[PDB]
Amino acid sequence: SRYEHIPGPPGRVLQDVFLDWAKKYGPVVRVNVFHKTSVIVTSPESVKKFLMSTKYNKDSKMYRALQTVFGERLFGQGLVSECNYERWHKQRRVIDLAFSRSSLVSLMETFNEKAEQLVEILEAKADGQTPVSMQDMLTYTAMDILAKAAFGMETSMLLGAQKPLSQAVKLMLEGITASRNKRKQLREVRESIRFLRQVGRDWVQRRREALKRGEEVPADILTQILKAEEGAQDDEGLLDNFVTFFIAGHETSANHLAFTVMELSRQPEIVARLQAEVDEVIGSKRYLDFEDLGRLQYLSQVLKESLRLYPPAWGTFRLLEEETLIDGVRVPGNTPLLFSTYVMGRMDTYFEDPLTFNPDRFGPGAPKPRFTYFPFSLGHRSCIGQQFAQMEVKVVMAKLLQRLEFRLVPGQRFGLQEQATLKPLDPVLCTLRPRGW
Numbered sequence: 001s002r003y004e005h006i007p008g009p010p011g012r013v014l015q016d017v018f019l020d021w022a023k024k025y026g027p028v029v030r031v032n033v034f035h036k037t038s039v040i041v042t043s044p045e046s047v048k049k050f051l052m053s054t055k056y057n058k059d060s061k062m063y064r065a066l067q068t069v070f071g072e073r074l075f076g077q078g079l080v081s082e083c084n085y086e087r088w089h090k091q092r093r094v095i096d097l098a099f100s101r102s103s104l105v106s107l108m109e110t111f112n113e114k115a116e117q118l119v120e121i122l123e124a125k126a127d128g129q130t131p132v133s134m135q136d137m138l139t140y141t142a143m144d145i146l147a148k149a150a151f152g153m154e155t156s157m158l159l160g161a162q163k164p165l166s167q168a169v170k171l172m173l174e175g176i177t178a179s180r181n182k183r184k185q186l187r188e189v190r191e192s193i194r195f196l197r198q199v200g201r202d203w204v205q206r207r208r209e210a211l212k213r214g215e216e217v218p219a220d221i222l223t224q225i226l227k228a229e230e231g232a233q234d235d236e237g238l239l240d241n242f243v244t245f246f247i248a249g250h251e252t253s254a255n256h257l258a259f260t261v262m263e264l265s266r267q268p269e270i271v272a273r274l275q276a277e278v279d280e281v282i283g284s285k286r287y288l289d290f291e292d293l294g295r296l297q298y299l300s301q302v303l304k305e306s307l308r309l310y311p312p313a314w315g316t317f318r319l320l321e322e323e324t325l326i327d328g329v330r331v332p333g334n335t336p337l338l339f340s341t342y343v344m345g346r347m348d349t350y351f352e353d354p355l356t357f358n359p360d361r362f363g364p365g366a367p368k369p370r371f372t373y374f375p376f377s378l379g380h381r382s383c384i385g386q387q388f389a390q391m392e393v394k395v396v397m398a399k400l401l402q403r404l405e406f407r408l409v410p411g412q413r414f415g416l417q418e419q420a421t422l423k424p425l426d427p428v429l430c431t432l433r434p435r436g437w
């Protein structure tokens with residue numbers, strides 16, 4: 001009853017229902033999400049006010065399903081799910097060091113090697129007949145990149161290794177989904193969560209043992225994760241961040257890659273342009289250097305446009321502590337505010353012809369979206385891995401475009417599913433040919 005005065009109702013996802021309601025009912029709408037009444041706020045003035053201020057913090061109630069699933073600690077109080085500002089701030093500042101320009105430059109070798117491995121595997125299947133799940137292949141690639149870059153671990157999923165680990169990730173993601181919106185499922189979800197955390201403990205022990213023997217350990221994300229816990233009473237905080245980075249550091253990247261490949265399969269003219277760009281910039285070099293990345297301007301634009309229509313992470317929540325007028329609507333104190341880049345990206349008020357895929361929206365001369373586009377969020381709680389993700393996906397995409405042509409198998413759909421993140425409904429089944437065929 002405390003919300004009844006707020007405007008709202010009396011391969012398709014809940015975010016689409018939210019979009020319809022925002023269009024119908026305006027910039028402040030009451031909805032039900034993850035068992036709780038929330039208010040979806042979709043004006044750019046509100047996006048700016050709430051995300052660009054340390055006064056507003058995340059609503060912990062909306063992150064519970066990350067923290068713990070079916071009584072098994074998952075991300076716990078790691079970097080995504082920690083909602084107390086001072087606790088968040090301490091760990092952010094320490095982990096930031098691993099995402100410095102110089103840090104990320106050093107990761108180019110890893111990005112290149114895994115992308116090259118993927119392309120060689122795909123080239124061997126490029127007979128224009130064999131169906132290849134690009135979602136699967138891109139997920140394996142993203143996992144292999146993350147594991148190596150962040151932890152110095154070789155998962156070798158591209159070689160078909162670590163099937164248990166692969167299963168654990170999938171069931172855990174299903175657990176998150178079920179938590180927020182029987183006996184065998186509970187059992188499998190719980191065991192998968194404990195497995196992921198045990199992977200953490202095992203790899204942490206290996207790291208500590210390497211350090212003790214004075215073996216060479218290149219500074220990475222894990223270094224800073226360890227550093228953040230220097231004087232902790234237990235390793236539970238460390239394992240929180242292990243699992244946080246293990247999952248967050250590949251899932252969304254994989255989703256973004258899958259969406260991009262899927263969309264480009266029906267954009268032959270754009271693909272031709274991307275191919276030409278890659279041809280001119282990198283030529284027949286096997287390896288992309290860091291300075292090549294900035295030169296792939298048209299690819300940057302396509303990837304931005306991909307994130308506008310297909311953000312893997314649709315948005316974020318802030319807790320409104322005191323009653324506030326938002327765009328002419330009285331919103332009670334202690335209310336989760338829902339921000340959605342998915343919704344605003346598809347609103348004609350913010351983007352002309354919103355369903356049209358147009359990389360030119362992000363062209364040099366074009367007016368930049370002002371608080372209407374935030375696939376990595378905005379403000380202090382924006383994605384720590386934003387530049388990491390942008391680099392790795394550009395490396396992977398450039399290498400695909402250099403070497404291969406992709407056709408979506410007829411019957412494959414362009415719809416989304418909502419399953420902890422947004423991802424293609426279908427496996428993005430494609431046939432492949434070498435370029436110049």
Ligand code: HEM
Pocket residue numbers: 079080092244245248249250252253256311312313314315316317374375376377380381382383384385386388389
């Ligand atoms: C295209 C790929 C990616 C997208 C679209 C994405 C999107 C986002 C979004 C929307 C948030 C804010 C979440 C919230 O408010 O609850 C976020 C935060 C975060 N992302 Fe990402 N992300 C991506 C890749 C990565 C990568 C590669 C890493 C790690 C290597 C990563 C780690 C994180 C972490 C740790 C946070 C929490 C940061 C903080 O609160 O201080 N993400 N990301």
Ligand SMILES: O=C(c1cnc2c(-c3cnco3)cc(C(F)(F)F)cn12)N1CCOCC1
Pocket residue numbers: 062063066080176247248249251252313315316317383420421
């Ligand atoms: O669960 C989230 C969330 C926000 N960010 C992420 C990321 C992520 C960010 N960067 C890379 O990965 C991954 C996942 C995971 F593990 F489910 F796939 C969940 N999240 N929430 C915020 C939205 O509102 C509801 C609760």
